[PDB]
Design a protein around this nucleic acid. Sequence first.
RNA 1: UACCCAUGUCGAAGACAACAAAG
RNA 2: UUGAUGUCACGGAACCUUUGUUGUCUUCGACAUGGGUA
Lengths: 464, 1452
Amino acid sequence: NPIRDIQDRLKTAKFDNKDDMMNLASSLYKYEKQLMDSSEATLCQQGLSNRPNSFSQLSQFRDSDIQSKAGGQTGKFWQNEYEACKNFQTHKERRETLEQIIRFLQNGAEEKDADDLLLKTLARAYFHRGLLYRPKGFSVPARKVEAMKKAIAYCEIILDKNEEESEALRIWLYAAMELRRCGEEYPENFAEKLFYLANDGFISELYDIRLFLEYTEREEDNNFLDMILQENQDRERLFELCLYKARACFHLNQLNDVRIYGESAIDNAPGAFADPFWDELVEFIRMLRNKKSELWKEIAIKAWDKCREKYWARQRELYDLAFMAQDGIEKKTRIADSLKSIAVHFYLNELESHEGGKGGHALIYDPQKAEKDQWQDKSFDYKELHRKFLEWQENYILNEEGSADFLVTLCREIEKAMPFLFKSEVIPEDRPVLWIPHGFLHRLPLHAAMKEIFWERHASRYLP
Amino acid sequence: MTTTMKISIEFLEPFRMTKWQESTRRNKNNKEFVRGQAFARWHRNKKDNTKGRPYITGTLLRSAVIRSAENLLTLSDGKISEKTCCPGKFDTEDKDRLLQLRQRSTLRWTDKNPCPDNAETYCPFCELLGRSFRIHFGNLSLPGKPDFDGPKAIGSQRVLNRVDFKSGKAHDFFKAYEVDHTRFPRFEGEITIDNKVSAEARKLLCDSLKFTDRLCGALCVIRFDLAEKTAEQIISILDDNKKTEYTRLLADAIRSLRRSSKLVAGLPKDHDGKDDHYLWDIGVTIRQILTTSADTKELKNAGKWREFCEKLGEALYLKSKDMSGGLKITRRILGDAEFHGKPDRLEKSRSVSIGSVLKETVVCGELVAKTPFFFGAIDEDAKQTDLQVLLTPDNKYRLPRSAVRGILRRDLQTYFDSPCNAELGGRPCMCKTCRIMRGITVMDARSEYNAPPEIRHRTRINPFTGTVAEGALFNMEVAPEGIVFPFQLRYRGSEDGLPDALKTVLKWWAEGQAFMSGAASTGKGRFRMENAKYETLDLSDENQRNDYLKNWGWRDEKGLEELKKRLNSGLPEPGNYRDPKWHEINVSIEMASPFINGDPIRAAVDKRGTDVVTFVKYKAEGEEAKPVCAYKAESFRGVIRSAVARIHMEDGVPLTELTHSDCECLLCQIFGSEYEAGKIRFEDLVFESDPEPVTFDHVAIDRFTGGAADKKKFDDSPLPGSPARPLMLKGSFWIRRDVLEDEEYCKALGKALADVNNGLYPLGGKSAIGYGQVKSLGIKGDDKRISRLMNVAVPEKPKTDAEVRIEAEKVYYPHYFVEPHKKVEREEKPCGHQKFHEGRLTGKIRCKLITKTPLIVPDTSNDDFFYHKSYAFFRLHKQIMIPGSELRGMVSSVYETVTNSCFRIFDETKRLSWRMDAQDFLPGRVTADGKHIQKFSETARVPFYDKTQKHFDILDEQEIAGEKPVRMWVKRFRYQKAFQEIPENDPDGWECKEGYLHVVGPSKVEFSDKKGDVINNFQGTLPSVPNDWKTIRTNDFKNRKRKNEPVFCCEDDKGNYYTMAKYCETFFFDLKENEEYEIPEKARIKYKELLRVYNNNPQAVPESVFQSRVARENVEKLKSGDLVYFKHNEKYVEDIVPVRISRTVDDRMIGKRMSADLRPCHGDWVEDGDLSALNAYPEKRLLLRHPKGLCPACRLFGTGSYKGRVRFGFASLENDPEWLIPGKNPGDPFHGGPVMLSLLERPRPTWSIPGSDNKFKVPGRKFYVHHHAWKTIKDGNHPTTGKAIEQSPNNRTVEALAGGNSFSFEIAFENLKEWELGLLIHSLQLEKGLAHKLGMAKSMGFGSVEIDVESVRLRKDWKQWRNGNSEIPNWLGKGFAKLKEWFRDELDFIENLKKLLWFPEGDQAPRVCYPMLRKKDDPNGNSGYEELKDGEFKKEDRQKKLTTPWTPWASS
RNA sequence: UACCCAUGUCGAAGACAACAAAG
RNA sequence: UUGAUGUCACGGAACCUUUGUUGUCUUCGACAUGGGUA
Ligand SMILES: [Zn+2]
Ligand SMILES: [Zn+2]
Ligand SMILES: [Zn+2]
Ligand SMILES: [Zn+2]
């Protein structure tokens, strides 16, 4: 009964009090919302008990400055409740709660007389609405980018008037970081806004920690890492904090405790792969490799162990790092077999292919040889081989009976890209060969490799 | 040295242009910039201004030429003339410097390696590529390079979306500028060719130029060698007359006039035929302004007039939006941003050979719109219409190429039954649908027809309250059916002809199943391919290829005309044909009741002049539009969807109560939801025979006064329908064959259509008064899969227990009042309309009505059937009927009285006024502030209109007006007179005092059309009426012997004799400056009401010279310095009057004179205030509603917010008419004779409420008693006096039936409790000895009718109906028990109602008549109204006698 | 500043209230 | 108003959901005007 709620709010309402105005605005908004969507509560055909006094109270409430101020306070209260109750609510409950805040404030933010609290809450509401989008597959959702861009636009209004606004500067940088994660470039004034944050301290938010880490990696200065280390480790999200502290220690040349912080982050990790921690962990491993620090070879293996114990776009990159980090050929076979879902094992390392290296690794195991030479690691470049496969595949569809030339070239390309197939040293003659391919190699005819066709010397079997 | 080759590009379609980008944002990282790389660009002369011109990049032309050269070399085995062409090099090491990398496969013609990086000579293809600036492609720009204000000056940006195949809903969208080829067809450029370029390379370049068929999104041929002033005037007119609530109605009506300028001459008049229409004659008037505009020389052209009307309507709409706070548009939270495809940067190319076989098939036909269509295209500058259709700049309907390609892709995917789950970017998709589409060319088409689109109003109904949902009202532009678009399709591929999928799709289109536009669920966009012709061209043949190149593929107009001569008729026969997925179901609806589909805007421009007319649609018959009455597809779809939803449940919850989020119920699977398209499509229903609409007049009757309520008098023009001549409504709807083969969905549709067939779901509006009743509904084409499901005497009424004792020597009042009970039972939540609730009764009641006295139900369409107004009995198609609205109101009054309820119709804001009679009022003058009145001490009479003095001559205009003070001698002895100069007769005893003059004019006038004592005693000729009130002088004396009582006797040219008996004005002197009294706004409102009553007086004297200043000079407000009589309290004034004896205005509205519970549940604002400060907020409605809910009458018969639960049908005569008076023609027994009635005059609330005392309340509900004065009227005599009735312009002659006529009608009730149905049956049948009153002249003895219940049928289920005659006593008992529960034995209003409903017995004729004005006017000797005012009907005990039924007012 | 009334005429309502696009 | 040995943008239906509908007896009697005399 929304009408009874409005009557109760008007029964004892003081227009100099913030709480009463917030309650009255919430009741009126809820009544209007239930009217709009044609719910069962629209059957309430009654009105207000005391017309002469209710009319005066409503007229006083609907005056411009009281109504405008009550709207911002109501939006802030809902945002504060959401930030503490987001863990309890589900996806639909959180999504509906945030969209309610946006609608309540969007009708007033278009004017020039809107207060900063209206813009700050609305910008923060959009920032958290965009974080609810789980990145599925390689394609980033197009509405997460829109939400971050919309949050930035609201913050830019405040920042133009007040460059050093404390709350608006954070949200502008929070959304700018999200745009880079999605795939978009940094905004046109990212360097300026980030440098304005140098004359500030942490607001205890975990998102502030990574903001100063990026400042450290841009200006090469280490005047904020000491503050990061002396933090409280009793927080709920200890895994995210430990990962940040490892980065801070790395720039300070504290190599010993980086493993300790990384160990806790890996051992204590969230089960869900949609958490931003997993993306940050992969970048942390890539950061060590990019700076030629011989330390990622140990963190990556430990991270893979936890990941296996527990889709995610970075997941295949995590397997690639474990494949590269591990120096044992026998262990690398088990890593490759998980993704697939004389024995010759194939694994296509997309990370090394992007760097120009031989991303195709052939793992040949001959039991009859000694343990030192039992495993052989043969590397090849499959970029040219893949292009030949695509040409044959398209020619087969577009022009049947004319793709035989492409098939012969494709079969010959296999031998040219994999010279270790007709060599007796690599594979002894007259012995069966088992094929367990990975990636597009399933459709690639391996037994038909021509130099002399492959089947004239070895037998072939396929395991999916 | 080089050579210049001039290039001209002619566009055959609207090409696409990309928006201007900042120079820093022209890189690979800007998605929008890369997306528009295939479009024409926009140039800015200055970077800070949008002024510039469009152009086409030469790199785009080079890329198109390279692609064409690849195709040609593939055709000719890579040989041009004698030389052989290498495959060419399309690989570079520095791939980061290239803005775009090739994603498509490169065509292969030779297996050799490309030309060496350094070589003496290159192949012709390599020379064309530029490896050997050998060939420089210049930019293409408009001839002469003009300048425009911006990109909007040459084209309009249009939104193009991407629709998900599975759901049928747009996944995302993007925008592009479309520049019409008609306005900008030519772009000119140059190609610079070095002299070292080989002849083979030049020939290849020329062939590639001639082979390039499209560029910049359009097919191309490349050759080488007042309204604002009118709006301001209308807005000023509306503001000056204080009529601004009509702004949006005027905007819509004026925009509706764009069809033709001849509609202005046909604008409706008032009901008297004069130019007093409430819309067009508000002001110069609006009608005159529109008439002047239509006759303007500039606006003679149809297009200019249409533009003027559109601009005027838009301006008025924008002005109307400002009145509600402004134009606020809700914006989407997320998802309202464009999505652009992101190409993938591929390292190396991919050579693919497609073979040397290439055949191009041309299909030409016509796409004829079999249904109205809608191609959505919203103009940001057109806010008036919510949904808009796509049009060309010359206002021609457009068939966009993008929509045709999308529909073709959808149909190909449907044929293959395999959706294409591809994403924008990357290498081309290799699925069969994409392979077919990459060879498909369709040409954008437009229509010759260019009439303005029709606007359809659409709403969404709240399933719970049965009324419109909040914010659910919008317009929709709809393109008419019958529009023909040219169709040209070309397929280029290696097949011997069209693909089997394409053949099947084209055969589906040729059968009429071409759904190509949006809003398909409401029957929009069904086309048919007609007169289709096809031909296949073998481009592999060298001669055929050369002929194709020479004629540019016959793309241009001349080439296309030449090519159409060699097209084979028909379409190729599909080898593998799959049946269409949609099936057509024919609907036949028969209705035996009037039908209306409301179109209020069309009624404002219709010459009929009614409140609402029925919906009509327009068909495009070539260049002319044909208006046809039809039933909207949206309304029929909504009715069917409501029928389906209210029957079924999802997990125990009705489908009407679901939010349909993550839902898979049958409603979302048949009719669709907001997340997916529906699987059923409803079309418009047209009537088999075109009917002429008829006008039915309606009026709302006040429950207290018993007369017409204020502001409530209306009419409608539905399509007539009677049982004798039913309305036949025919049409069809399309259902997808997957649904038609599902037994559950067929069962649901059959149940819904069986409920509709049983009359539970009327079509159209105003179903409460008997409109839209469905007698039957037929379904064909479903193979009986849906049509399968479509397939005790009443106890006597009890004898009455009411006894009324009638005496012969007594005369009774025509009407009495029933005093209501103090308690009104209300409920906050009525029964919802979303389902058939358990424990509730639904069905029909069949009733029989028999007349006991002559009945008058006029047919007011013609007021001159026999100035004097003559009416015939109501008829519909030569059949005597009673409209269901009169029966509904008659039964509603009795139901409101039996179940003590609010006065449903009551003018709450009425403020009463009473005339003063001949002391507390004191003289006063309004201060300069205007908020205070200063008291005067004493007054004297100044003779102004006699011959004693010459005051009018001596005094001044300001002195007469009283603005400036005057000095006059005053005498006190009693002798209170103030002569300005001392008379020469008596010069002693005068005192001089200063004051003000209160001169209002000679207004104490006695006027008549006869001659009285004063007129008869006048000697000589009566002077004519003077033209000035200042020149009036006394001519005679009433008391001649004593020479007093001066009068002025004059005669009018019309025969009126005027006797003015005033000769003195009042002199206000001795002003008190220290006795200022405040004027409250309540007194100002009272004085405003007094002035309004003074200025609007039907009984005013015809000559204005005999009126007071307030009436003669039309005073509208109290001003400073006014001289008035006022009464005051210690600090404030109470009542203000302008003259000595005037009106006393009531302090409160009449709504405050009754109990707060008896007022209407949803009424007006009676408290002191404005309530206009909350118009823009939804809580203003809560201040107009009772705190406790709705009374039993408002829950059953409904309110503005709650739909009623009873429907009253028309009552039809059962036998041959028995007329009261035989007709003049004995051979025509179907028409009766005329009978003339007395004057019917307005009810007077001041009689029932004698004065301003708080003891005077509203007496109650007025009911008319039963008597037999109709016999006296039939004899031709006045019921009161007995004299013969004289014909006058104010009385009426009617055709009336007699007693013994039987009518039959049915009442449909839904979700009624047993006590509600029992009380309704009780209010219908009443009891033996009781009767209703219906029709005209109820106070004269006409209209006594009796209703008998004949059968009650109940709806047990959707399929089974059961007889309910056995449960009538139980229902009556439950209703009586409910009445006892509400009022524990204190049922005194029921007894009074039964006494007033009592019908006289045999040999018992009461004498019932209204008293005359005065006893001298009554030959019978009975006392008049004046005698009763101080006699038996004193104000002390007048309401007591008026509220006691059958109380005599005379004792003859 | 205390009393006294006099005249016999005349049509009224002609749309109003809500929704004015929202997802 | 582009560079050029690489542009499948004819690679993308402004698409999907919504009842111009709810409420109202072509009805009906006392009013209108402002003074006059002492
Ligand atoms: Zn070459
Ligand atoms: Zn495809
Ligand atoms: Zn559903
Ligand atoms: Zn009520």
